[PDB]
Structures are given as C-alpha cells and as structure tokens.
Amino acid sequence: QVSGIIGNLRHMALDMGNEIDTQNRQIDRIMEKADSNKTRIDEANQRATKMLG
Amino acid sequence: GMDTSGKQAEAMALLAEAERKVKNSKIEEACEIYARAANMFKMAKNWSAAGNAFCQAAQLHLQLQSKHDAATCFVDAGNAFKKADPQEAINCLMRAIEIYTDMGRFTIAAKHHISIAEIYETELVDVEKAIAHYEQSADYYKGEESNSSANKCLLKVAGYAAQLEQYQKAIDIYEQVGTSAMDSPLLKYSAKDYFFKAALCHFCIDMLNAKLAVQKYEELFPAFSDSRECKLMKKLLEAHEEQNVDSYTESVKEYDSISRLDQWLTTMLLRIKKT
Amino acid sequence: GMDTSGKQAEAMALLAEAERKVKNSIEEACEIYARAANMFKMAKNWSAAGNAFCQAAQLHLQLQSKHDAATCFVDAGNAFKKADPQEAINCLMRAIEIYTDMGRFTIAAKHHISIAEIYETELVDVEKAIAHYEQSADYYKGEESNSSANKCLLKVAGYAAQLEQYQKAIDIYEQVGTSAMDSPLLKYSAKDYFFKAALCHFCIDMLNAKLAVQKYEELFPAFSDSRECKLMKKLLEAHEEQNVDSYTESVKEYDSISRLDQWLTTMLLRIKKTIQ
Amino acid sequence: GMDTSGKQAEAMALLAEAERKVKNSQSFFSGLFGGSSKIEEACEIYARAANMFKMAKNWSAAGNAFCQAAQLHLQLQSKHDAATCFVDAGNAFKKADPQEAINCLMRAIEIYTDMGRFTIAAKHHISIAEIYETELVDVEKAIAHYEQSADYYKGEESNSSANKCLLKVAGYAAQLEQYQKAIDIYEQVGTSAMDSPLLKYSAKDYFFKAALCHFCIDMLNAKLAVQKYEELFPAFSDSRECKLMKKLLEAHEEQNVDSYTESVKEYDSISRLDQWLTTMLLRIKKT
Amino acid sequence: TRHSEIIKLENSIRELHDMFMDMAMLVESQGEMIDRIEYNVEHAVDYVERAVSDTKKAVKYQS
C-alpha cells in the first residue's frame, strides 16, 4: 500500500511545480513595472512643479 | 518569404521617414519616432539594425531628461544584442548598472550583474570576467541583506573556483554557507551536503590531515554521523589508504546508485583516485 | 582605490554644498544630502555614510515630513546596522516611534524584532530582547496576525521557561493547544505545546508535573496516542522508583531515536539533578 | 503602568482638544465661512486619539473616536472616506464587541455597493457572517450572508474566494439535516473539481459527504448513490471513504453493530475523526 | 526483488528532496519579492495620496 501511495504522492509534487515556477516569473515582471510606474508618477509630480517654478 | 521582405521594407521606410523628420520641442518627437522605428525593426526580425536603432534611441533618451527610461532602454538593448556582438551589450548593461546604482537601486544592479555574468559565461569561453560581476552582485546583495541571492552567488563562485583548482576559497565559502545554514532555521538539514563539498576540497589536499579534519567536522556537528556524507568520506579514506582497485570502484558505484553525482564531483573524485 | 577616493570627495563636496545652501536659506539640500549618502555607499565604505543619512533624515523631518522621513530614518538605521549598532538601534527606535504615531504597527514590530535579534547576536542583552518581542507580539495582536502572534508567544514562553517563571508559558501552551484542537492542520504541533508545558511543570514539583501531564492528556485525546505519553509515563515511573538506570536508558533511547537540540537534554538533566 | 497611565492621560487630553475644535468649527464656519478644513482636522485628531488608545489597548475609546471621525467625514459628503472610517470603527469594535460592528459593516457594504466596490462589500459580508457565527449560533443567517458575499464576488468576476464560502456553507448545511440542497451543492462542487486535476482529489471527500447525507434516508437509495458515484468516479474506490461506506452498508445489512464500531474505530485510527463525521455516524447508527 | 523496490523508493525520496529544496528556495525568493513590492506599493500609494490631497487643497484655495 505505502508503495502505491508514495507513487501517487510523487505525481502530486509534479502538479504543484506546474504552477509554482511560472508564478514567480510573472511576479518579477509586475514588480519591474511597478517600479517604473512609481517613477512615472514621480516624474509627473516633477512636471507638475515645472510650470509652478 | 514575402512577409520578411515586407517587414524589412516597412522598417526601412519608417527609418527614412524618421530621419527626414528629425533632420527638418523637437527632441521629444525625435526620441519617440526613433523608439517607434526601433520597435518596428525589432518586429521585422532584423537583429543588427534593430539593436543599432535601439542603442541610438537610448542615447537620444540619455540626451533627454530621464533616468529610469534610459535604464530600461539600455537593458532592452542589451537583451536584444544578446544574440549579437556581446561586448556592446555588456558595456550597455554595465552603464545601466552604474545608472541604477547612482540612485541606489542596488537590487536591480545586482540582478543585472548576475545577468551579465551569465551571458559572459554562456556565450564566451572566458569565464573569469563573469567572476568579478558575480562577486559584485554578491556584495550588493550583502549590502541589501539578501541571504538567498548572496548564498547562490557564493556557491556558484566557489564551484567555479574549485573547477579552477582554487581549493582554499571554495572550501572557505562552502564552510561559511554550511555554518550559516546550520544557524538558520531552514536549510540546516541540507547543510550536510554542503559540508561534504568542503571536505572534498580538503580531501584533495592531503590524507594525514584528513583524519583531523573529519574529526573536527564531526565534533562540530555531531549529527553529521548519520549522514551518508560521512560514510562516503570514511570509505574514500579507507580506499585511498590501501592500493587496490575494487574499493573506489565499488564506492563510486554504490554512491551513484542513489543519485547521479555532479560533473565537478566526479572530476575531483577521478583526480584524487588517479594519484 | 581611486574609486573610493573619488566617491568620498564627491560626498564631501555634496555635503559642503548642502551646508552652504541651508546656511543661505528647500528640498534641494535634502536631495543633495541623499545623493551624497548614496555616493558614499557606492564606495563600499559603510562608515561615514550613516552620518549623511542621519543629516538628511533630520533635515527632511524638520519640515513636517511623516512618511518619507520615516523611510529615510529606516534606511539610515539599516546603514548603521553594519557600521554602528548603537546608531542603527537609535534610528530604528525613532522610525518605530514615528510609524506607530502614524499607525503603521507592522514596521514598528519588524524593527523591534530586528533590534531584539541584533541585541541577542551582536550585543549581550536578553531582557530588552524579551521586551521588544512582547511589544511586537502586542502590535501584531492589534493586527490579528495569527502566525506572528504564535511565533512570538512560543519564543516568549521558551525564554520564560529557560529563565523566568513558568505560569505565563504554561498558560500560553494551554491556550495554543485549545485553539489548535479545533484546527485540523495545526493539531499535529498542538501536542508538542502540551509536552513543553509538562516539562515546565516539572521545574516546580514531580506531583505537580504528574497532575499537569494528566490534565493535558485528558484535554487533548491525541496527546495520549503519541509515544510522548509513554515516554512521560516511563520517566515519571523511573523518578518515582528512584532508579537512575531506567532514566539513563530512557534518555539514551530518546536520543538515539530522535536527535536533540540541547534543550530537551538540558531540561531532563535539570529534572534529574533533584532526583537524589 | 506609569507609561500606560501617561498614554491614557495624553489620549484624554487629545480627545478634549478634539471636542473643543469640533465645537469651535461650527462657530468659525458661521462667522467666517472658512470651509471644511476644521472637520478634516478633527477627523485626523480623532484617528490619532484612536491610535493612542490602541497604544493603551482601549477598544471602546478607539471605536468611539473612529465613529466620530466617520460621521464627521460623512457630513463632508466624502462617502468613500466615511465608509472607510466606518469600516475601521467596526474593526476596532470587533476586538471588544461586534454589536456596533454589525451596523458599521451594513453601512459600509451599502456605500461600497452603491458605487460598485463589490469585492469589499463581499469581504464585509464574510466578516458579518463570521461575527454572527462566533457570537450567535444562528447558522441560517451566516449561510445567507455567505451566499450574498458569493454573489457580490461573482459580480466583480473575482473568484477563488466565493468557492470557499460555498464549500463552508455546504459543510454547515450538511449538519442541519437538509438533504436536497447539501447534496446538490456537493455534487456540483465535485463535478467542477474533477475537471481540474489539482482539485480532482478533493472531489472524493465531497462525494463521501453526499453519500453519507443520502445514507440517512435509507439503505436502498444509499446503495444507488454509491453506485452512481463509483460509475462517475471509479477512482473513488481507491479512497478509504468508499471502503468505509461499503463496510457500513454491509454491517447494516446484518445489523452487526460490533462490526460497525470496529470499522469506525479503525477509520478513526487511520485518520482522526471530525465532529460532523462523528455526528453523521451516530445518526446513521440510529437506524 | 526487494532490492529493486528499495532502490526505487530511495530514488523517489531523493527526487522529492531535490524538488522540495528547489521549490522552497524559489518560494523564499517569491516571498522576498512580494515583501519588496508590498513596501513599494505602500510607499507609492501614500505618496500619491499626499500629492493629490495637496493638489486638491491648492486648487480649492486658489479657486
């Protein structure tokens, strides 16, 4: 019985992987975008102060 | 095919129109049109011209008042040139790293350092240059207190050094990583494996000090006794003590039967067995 | 090297320019100070950058800044953590106070934990570390953070059992076991908490320990199923019959079957010291 | 402690100053028409006082300050910020007593659904359901709140949270002696789970729950349900649940109570039982 | 046949250990990145809220 079970268990492990790695990659991308976004708004603020002087 | 020729013709026409517009407030329009031309050339599957246009647009943006956009353009140009002249891409990525570090973006700087090290090692045969970039990335991570990336970089550089016969630095790095993992709540149980790596280096140096080294490692980490790494170390020592052929062959066969030994591990094992 | 000298000169020039600007006179001075601090950091000379960071933080906070000032103070404290632990602790405490006044208890608790761990590792101080852990536990309780609250409770109970009275640790273990009883996922660890309490109850008296372990077994049926119940029964019987051979055999078997981290061995030795 | 006493005194002084400022705000507006800056300053001071009370660990005072800030900002037409302040007040009350939290969350949900903030409305409905479950035992109200929260979540197309609410609702319903709804929900969840390989394993538990729910009716229909589950999911036979239900049916065929008890004990040893499982087994043994 | 099943189980255990280590390191990196982005987004939202409040105050005072 244990043998069979462990076999099944191995399959489950693979299943988790099918998602995990991919998710991490996606996160990295959005992180980069977020940083850029912040800069952009900061730049906008600076531009908003350009006319005020 | 026809599609590639049409894409090339469209890219050439767009570049000519951009040149006409720039030749005849205008700086922003020139930058935007140059970026659009670079994107079109990239979509046209022309690597050299697309990379050159992207580099020119990045330089124009540098002329423009902006920093993050310049760094993004630099990294995109480096990625594009990844399949082109490596030297220009490396220089552009180094400049982007400097720009990032200027405002304190040390995390992205370390990431780009690791990227340039990776490209240098995979593309060219000179891997020594990548070692400096990896060390700089590790130092940046240590300054930022990133344990995982620092440990990965230290392990990679130690492995490369061991492949280069620099046993002292590799063994020091392996011991430091092992003790850090032991202190840390996680990765401690795997630290035994790291210890073996360090031991391997010492095993290549001498045999009479091997007994003292293994005794010190055992007393430092008494739980290491049940580890199969201690079994491998003692079996290798016993095999090397007596000049026979069966001992080392059966030891390597038995240890391989569980898991496939790494190429560097097997190379060092063969080197020690031959002598 | 030449790079370090150049960065140091640039930082000094920027500091002088900022000093001149502030003497003449608003955010330009703070920007110059931050740029000088970053340039000094580039040099890898961790020393003397923290001073620029503190100057920038003070100048920026003097003009009513709340969020940016707190972030700059946190950065200065992190910079000092490697350069000068005392300055890092001061900056972290200032940032904690500012953020807590702003209502951000997560950052305050994290900085308290960092101060406690730096005191435990770099310096020599446990009572202050315990107080910081308690404060972080209260802050995370305000946020109903179950994981951090449980971690802090376990750490506090362990430290108290090691050095302080055991009533608080015993109550914490009982509460954790009761909470985990309903939760299926955490039930496996629940028994361990009860086990810990038993050890604490042994520091006072043997009959009290017997009563406590009986109560823990009755409260949580699973505690009886685990072999730890048999181990406690054997230990209590050996103590009652006053036979060191049985105690030694039991501890040796426990060590051989399960590795020890010097905690259970220490408690067992403390229990055996009074066996006489 | 002395520090706690000092913090309480400072909080009381700040509350008195806020009361004076809000009192004088009306006079200033009448005499000069200075605007609404006074109300915003009073709300900020109330928030600071609530933070100080949290320093002193006073739930009631912090909740009162948050309510005052919420109403003051609501008078400013800032419906979103007023709803946020009401939500903060409800959270503060949850520490001591959620009695005010019920109306606070109701108002917050109404405000959020008026503008279209469906996710926060669903989360607040979930909070209301949890409050009712922990304070009262009236399951039906919690079920209704869970269905409302699920509907709100599906309104925003934000899944991965309504499904858990529906599963918890089905688990509650199974204990309330209702067959049709619980069985329908369990079978729907199972058939949805079989398609997804990750959740396919969890379908066996729902099939076993449905089989147990239908077993109380009679043995004949229980056997039909078991056969239907086996045909739909033959792999369910591999799980211990199918073996357990088959053993129970076989024991009941001969009224072998000792065999049933032995099987139940063996299953408990294999995996610790749950309150719902024990209740269902005891009810089944009645017939 | 006992040795075959024993070695198969050992190989499965070793593969599971390796996958555990890899995905655990990846999850730790993911947690570090999620913490960093949480801090960044908190700072950005606070900064934009302050800026928009200041802009609203300035425009209301001017008009």
Curated annotation (Swiss-Prot), chain A:
Origin superkingdom: Eukaryota
Domain t-SNARE coiled-coil homology residue range list: 1-51
Localization: Cytoplasm, Perinuclear region; Cell membrane; Synapse, Synaptosome; Photoreceptor inner segment
Residue list for modification Phosphoserine: S3, S36
Annotated site ((Microbial infection) Cleavage): R29, I30, Q46, R47
Family: Belongs to the SNAP-25 family.
Role, per record: t-SNARE involved in the molecular regulation of neurotransmitter release. May play an important role in the synaptic function of specific neuronal systems. Associates with proteins involved in vesicle docking and membrane fusion. Regulates plasma membrane recycling through its interaction with CENPF. Modulates the gating characteristics of the delayed rectifier voltage-dependent potassium channel KCNB1 in pancreatic beta cells.
Protein name, as recorded: Synaptosomal-associated protein 25
Organism: Rattus norvegicus
Residues of the full protein shown: 152 to 204 of 206
From Swiss-Prot, chain B:
Keyword Protein transport on entry: yes
Location of Phosphoserine modifications: S184
InterPro entries per record: NSF_attach, TPR-like_helical_dom_sf
Localization per record: Cell membrane
GO CC annotations on file: glutamatergic synapse; neuromuscular junction; postsynapse; presynapse; presynaptic active zone membrane; synaptobrevin 2-SNAP-25-syntaxin-1a complex; terminal bouton
GO biological process: apical protein localization; brain development; intracellular protein transport; membrane fusion; neuron differentiation; positive regulation of ATP-dependent activity; protein-containing complex disassembly; regulation of synaptic vesicle priming
Membrane-spanning parts: none
Principal location listed in the UniProt entry: membrane
Pfam families: SNAP
Gene Ontology molecular function: protein-containing complex binding; SNARE binding; soluble NSF attachment protein activity; syntaxin binding
N-acetylmethionine found at: M2
Keywords carried by this UniProt record: Acetylation, Cell membrane, ER-Golgi transport, Membrane, Phosphoprotein, Protein transport, Transport
Topological relation to the membrane, as annotated: Peripheral membrane protein
Reported function: Required for vesicular transport between the endoplasmic reticulum and the Golgi apparatus. Together with GNA12 promotes CDH5 localization to plasma membrane.
Family from the record: Belongs to the SNAP family.
Protein name per UniProt: Alpha-soluble NSF attachment protein
Gene expressing this chain: Napa
Curated annotation (Swiss-Prot), chain C:
Positions bearing N-acetylmethionine: M2
Pfam families (UniProt xref): SNAP
Swiss-Prot/TrEMBL keywords: Acetylation, Cell membrane, ER-Golgi transport, Membrane, Phosphoprotein, Protein transport, Transport
Entry's Gene Ontology cellular component terms: glutamatergic synapse; neuromuscular junction; postsynapse; presynapse; presynaptic active zone membrane; synaptobrevin 2-SNAP-25-syntaxin-1a complex; terminal bouton
Phosphoserine PTM positions: S183
Entry-linked InterPro entries: NSF_attach (IPR000744), TPR-like_helical_dom_sf (IPR011990)
Keyword Cytoplasm: no
Keyword Protein transport in record: yes
GO molecular function: protein-containing complex binding; SNARE binding; soluble NSF attachment protein activity; syntaxin binding
GO biological process annotation, one example: brain development
SUBUNIT field: Interacts with PRKCABP, and disrupts the interaction between GRIA2 and PRKCABP, leading to the internalization of GRIA2. Found in a complex with VAMP8. Component of a SNARE-like complex that contains at least ZW10, USE1L, RINT1, STX18 and NAPA/SNAP-alpha. Interacts with VTI1A. Interacts with STX12. Interacts with GNA12 (via N-terminus); the interaction promotes CDH5 localization to plasma membrane.
Summary of the function given for this chain in its UniProt record: Required for vesicular transport between the endoplasmic reticulum and the Golgi apparatus. Together with GNA12 promotes CDH5 localization to plasma membrane.
PANTHER family cross-referenced by the UniProt entry: ALPHA-SOLUBLE NSF ATTACHMENT PROTEIN (PTHR13768:SF23), SOLUBLE NSF ATTACHMENT PROTEIN SNAP (PTHR13768)
Protein family membership: Belongs to the SNAP family.
Protein's name in the database: Alpha-soluble NSF attachment protein
Organism of provenance: Rattus norvegicus
Curated annotation (Swiss-Prot), chain E:
Cellular component GO terms, alphabetical: acrosomal vesicle; actomyosin; axon; endomembrane system; glutamatergic synapse; membrane; neuron projection; nuclear membrane
Key word Protein biosynthesis present: no
Keyword Transport: yes
Domain called t-SNARE coiled-coil homology: residue spans: 1-58
Gene Ontology annotations of biological process type: calcium-ion regulated exocytosis; exocytosis; hormone secretion; insulin secretion; intracellular protein transport; modulation of excitatory postsynaptic potential; neurotransmitter transport; positive regulation of calcium ion-dependent exocytosis
Annotated site location: (Microbial infection) Cleavage: K57, A58
GO MF term set: ATP-dependent protein binding; calcium channel inhibitor activity; calcium-dependent protein binding; chloride channel inhibitor activity; identical protein binding; kinase binding; myosin binding; myosin head/neck binding
Keyword list, A-Z: Cell membrane, Coiled coil, Cytoplasmic vesicle, Exocytosis, Isopeptide bond, Membrane, Neurotransmitter transport, Phosphoprotein, Synapse, Synaptosome, Transmembrane, Transmembrane helix, Transport, Ubl conjugation
Organism domain of life: Eukaryota
Tissue: Expressed predominantly in cerebral cortex, hippocampus, cerebellum, adrenal medulla and retina with weak expression detected in non-neuronal tissues.
PTM comment: Phosphorylated by CK2.
Covalent link (Glycyl lysine isopeptide (Lys-Gly) (interchain with G-Cter in SUMO)) residue numbers: K56, K57, K60
Annotated localization: Cytoplasmic vesicle, Secretory vesicle, Synaptic vesicle membrane; Cell membrane; Synapse, Synaptosome
Cleaved signal peptide residues: none
Family listed: Belongs to the syntaxin family.
UniProt name for this protein: Syntaxin-1A
Organism of this sequence: Rattus norvegicus
Taxonomic placement: Eukaryota, Metazoa, Chordata, Craniata, Vertebrata
